[PDB]
Design a protein around this motif. Structure first.
Motif, PDB file in Angstrom:
ATOM      1  N   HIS A   1      18.953 -56.306 -31.071  1.00  0.00           N
ATOM      2  CA  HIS A   1      19.001 -57.312 -32.127  1.00  0.00           C
ATOM      3  C   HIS A   1      17.868 -57.159 -33.139  1.00  0.00           C
ATOM      4  N   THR A   2      16.897 -56.305 -32.833  1.00  0.00           N
ATOM      5  CA  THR A   2      15.780 -56.088 -33.747  1.00  0.00           C
ATOM      6  C   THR A   2      15.342 -54.630 -33.782  1.00  0.00           C
ATOM      7  N   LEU A   3      15.350 -54.044 -34.974  1.00  0.00           N
ATOM      8  CA  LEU A   3      14.899 -52.670 -35.151  1.00  0.00           C
ATOM      9  C   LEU A   3      13.848 -52.584 -36.253  1.00  0.00           C
ATOM     10  N   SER A   4      12.592 -52.431 -35.849  1.00  0.00           N
ATOM     11  CA  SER A   4      11.481 -52.365 -36.791  1.00  0.00           C
ATOM     12  C   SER A   4      11.111 -50.918 -37.095  1.00  0.00           C
TER      13      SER A   4
ATOM     14  N   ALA B   1      18.684 -60.423 -41.765  1.00  0.00           N
ATOM     15  CA  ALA B   1      17.528 -60.146 -42.609  1.00  0.00           C
ATOM     16  C   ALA B   1      17.146 -58.670 -42.581  1.00  0.00           C
ATOM     17  N   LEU B   2      17.366 -57.985 -43.700  1.00  0.00           N
ATOM     18  CA  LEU B   2      16.976 -56.585 -43.821  1.00  0.00           C
ATOM     19  C   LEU B   2      15.967 -56.405 -44.950  1.00  0.00           C
TER      20      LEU B   2
ATOM     21  N   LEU C   1      16.651 -55.830 -39.377  1.00  0.00           N
ATOM     22  CA  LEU C   1      16.346 -54.412 -39.532  1.00  0.00           C
ATOM     23  C   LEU C   1      15.362 -54.191 -40.675  1.00  0.00           C
ATOM     24  N   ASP C   2      14.201 -53.627 -40.360  1.00  0.00           N
ATOM     25  CA  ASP C   2      13.179 -53.390 -41.371  1.00  0.00           C
ATOM     26  C   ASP C   2      12.965 -51.896 -41.595  1.00  0.00           C
ATOM     27  N   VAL C   3      13.256 -51.431 -42.806  1.00  0.00           N
ATOM     28  CA  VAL C   3      13.067 -50.025 -43.150  1.00  0.00           C
ATOM     29  C   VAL C   3      12.204 -49.876 -44.401  1.00  0.00           C
TER      30      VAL C   3
ATOM     31  N   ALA D   1      23.680 -60.464 -45.198  1.00  0.00           N
ATOM     32  CA  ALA D   1      22.293 -60.609 -45.630  1.00  0.00           C
ATOM     33  C   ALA D   1      22.200 -61.295 -46.989  1.00  0.00           C
ATOM     34  N   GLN D   2      23.287 -61.943 -47.396  1.00  0.00           N
ATOM     35  CA  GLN D   2      23.326 -62.654 -48.667  1.00  0.00           C
ATOM     36  C   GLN D   2      23.017 -64.137 -48.506  1.00  0.00           C
ATOM     37  N   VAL D   3      22.676 -64.776 -49.619  1.00  0.00           N
ATOM     38  CA  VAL D   3      22.688 -66.228 -49.701  1.00  0.00           C
ATOM     39  C   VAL D   3      23.853 -66.624 -50.606  1.00  0.00           C
TER      40      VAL D   3
END
Ligand SMILES: *[C@@H]1O[C@H](CO)[C@@H](O[C@@H]2O[C@H](CO)[C@@H](O)[C@H](O)[C@H]2NC(C)=O)[C@H](O)[C@H]1NC(C)=O
Ligand SMILES: *[C@@H]1O[C@H](CO)[C@@H](O[C@@H]2O[C@H](CO)[C@@H](O)[C@H](O)[C@H]2NC(C)=O)[C@H](O)[C@H]1NC(C)=O
Lengths: 270, 270
Positions: A156-159, A213-214, A182-184, A201-203
């Motif tokens: 669920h989390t990839l940093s 959240a990317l 996911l943070d790249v 990942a939109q509002v």
């Protein structure tokens, strides 16, 4: 039982061995093998031996954060069958061998951030397929074993921010439905693969909050029509910047209209 | 004059060019050459070219903190005759060539912390002899050009913690009277050279405060009589730890009486 410096405490039925900020230079010899939690953070351990964490079957949480660890013996984590969380952040690690993380089936959290990782051998993540969190941030990585990552359904989390990652496969995140972050950031990515998780990942609007959240800032983006799918998204400006084509070099990713994201038709030279 | 993203402000007679946190990937082309302060911190610059900081004679303060800088062109800082402070912390630098810091006579502050520095060529500090601060912390350094450091009389701060420094010359800090702080924590030091500045690191009694501050924790100390001079000092316990002899391995540096710091007489084998 508990080493001279360490403050090992007992709460039924678990045994914790607290050896954080004790100025250690190596892992203390006589740590009780039936320990459940072991904090060795904020010391000065340079290398791990098999005899350190051997036989610790009941260990569920190991913390080696902020040490001078540069090498760990192959099959030193072999007998940690019940380990769920491993903290190896802020060290001097360089490589990730297969023998390093072998047999860690019950591992759910793996943290390697702020290390000087250059290479990760394939099949190194063939035993941690059932993890939920993977922090490989602040390293010198350009490629990771994506095939082993694709077999991580419960992830669920990839940093991955602050590396030197060249590109990223398109077939990834297919069955990874539980992925929520996911943070790249700060990588050397030219483009990005489209995915329904990114559509999340939109509002949008009733009103709706972003459930995914990317972050893809600080990347040498190639602003063509292959990124047009991402530009059509409605997201907050995170100071993203294009690097090519030269006409789009320097201008913000979100400051450029959709009609300027163009591609080029194929032609035959000879 | 001021780049599209940058917020260059003017206060007589100085010109500052503020380009921090703008998502830059390279140093903006049209920065006014008569700028005095230039903030390029918190961006994503990967490499510096000569054309970037060329001709900037009036520049007195340059900030390149927290970037992805991995290489800088030789003689790119050549024309910064009036530069006093340089911030290159938190990047991806590997080496320090002589051409890198050439002609920086008026440089008083040089900061290279949180870089992956492995080697520093000698004579690289032969032009910054008149600096006051040198931060080389959090690097992979084991040796530095001490000879060039000994020619830094006006030096008052030397940050060297969290490296892999093998040893340190005994003749250093001889004429460096203005030195008031030295940090050598988390290094691979076996011993330490005696110095009157270290005699000034005590709390004594009237009562007296420590006017000099040194830190030598997290080091594989060789607790013999060659460190007995330091044990005789009256200082606060900073969790220092001995690594050898094996009888003193593991015990705190300050927890060991002075009568146990011993050496061994010479004998002839053949
Ligand atoms: C791991 O556990 C074993 C016991 O499970 C420890 O004890 C013995 O190790 C010696 C090796 O010299 C063997 O000859 C014995 O047969 C072992 N005992 C038993 C009951 O099997 C062993 O010392 C432990 N190793 C470490 C590194 O802690
Ligand atoms: C540095 O300054 C010089 C002027 O001091 C700049 O201007 C000219 O550079 C060209 C090179 O193509 C020379 O032929 C001219 O003689 C220069 N002008 C003068 C008056 O000498 C130069 O462009 C500047 N360089 C950078 C990289 O900014």
């Amino acid at each position: 039982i508990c080493p001279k410096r360490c403050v090992c405490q007992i709460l039924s039925p678990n045994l914790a061995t607290l050896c954080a900020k004790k100025g250690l230079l190596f892992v203390p010899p006589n740590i009780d093998r039936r320990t459940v939690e072991l904090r060795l953070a904020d010391n000065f351990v340079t290398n791990i031996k098999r005899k350190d964490f051997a036989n610790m079957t009941s260990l569920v949480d190991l913390t080696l954060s902020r040490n001078t660890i540069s090498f760990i013996t192959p099959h030193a984590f072999a007998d940690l069958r019940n380990l769920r969380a491993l903290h190896l952040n802020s060290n001097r690690l360089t490589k990730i061998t297969n023998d390093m993380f072998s047999g860690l089936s019950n591992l759910h959290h793996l943290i390697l951030n702020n290390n000087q990782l250059t290479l990760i051998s394939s099949t190194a993540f063939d035993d941690v397929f059932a993890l939920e969190e993977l922090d490989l941030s602040y390293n010198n990585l350009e490629t990771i074993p994506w095939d082993a990552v694709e077999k991580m359904v419960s992830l669920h989390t990839l940093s991955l921010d602050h590396n030197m990652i060249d590109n990223i496969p398109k077939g990834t995140f297919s069955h990874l439905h539980k992925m929520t972050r996911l943070d790249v950031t700060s990588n050397k990515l030219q483009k990005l693969p489209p995915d329904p998780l990114f559509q999340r990942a939109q509002v949008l609007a009733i009103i709706s909050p972003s459930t995914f959240a990317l972050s893809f800032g600080g990347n040498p983006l190639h602003c063509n029509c292959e990124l047009l799918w991402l530009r059509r998204l409605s997201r907050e400006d995170d100071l993203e910047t294009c690097a090519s084509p030269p006409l789009l070099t320097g201008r913000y990713f979100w400051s450029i209209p959709e009609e300027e994201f163009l591609c080029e038709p194929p032609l035959i030279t000879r």
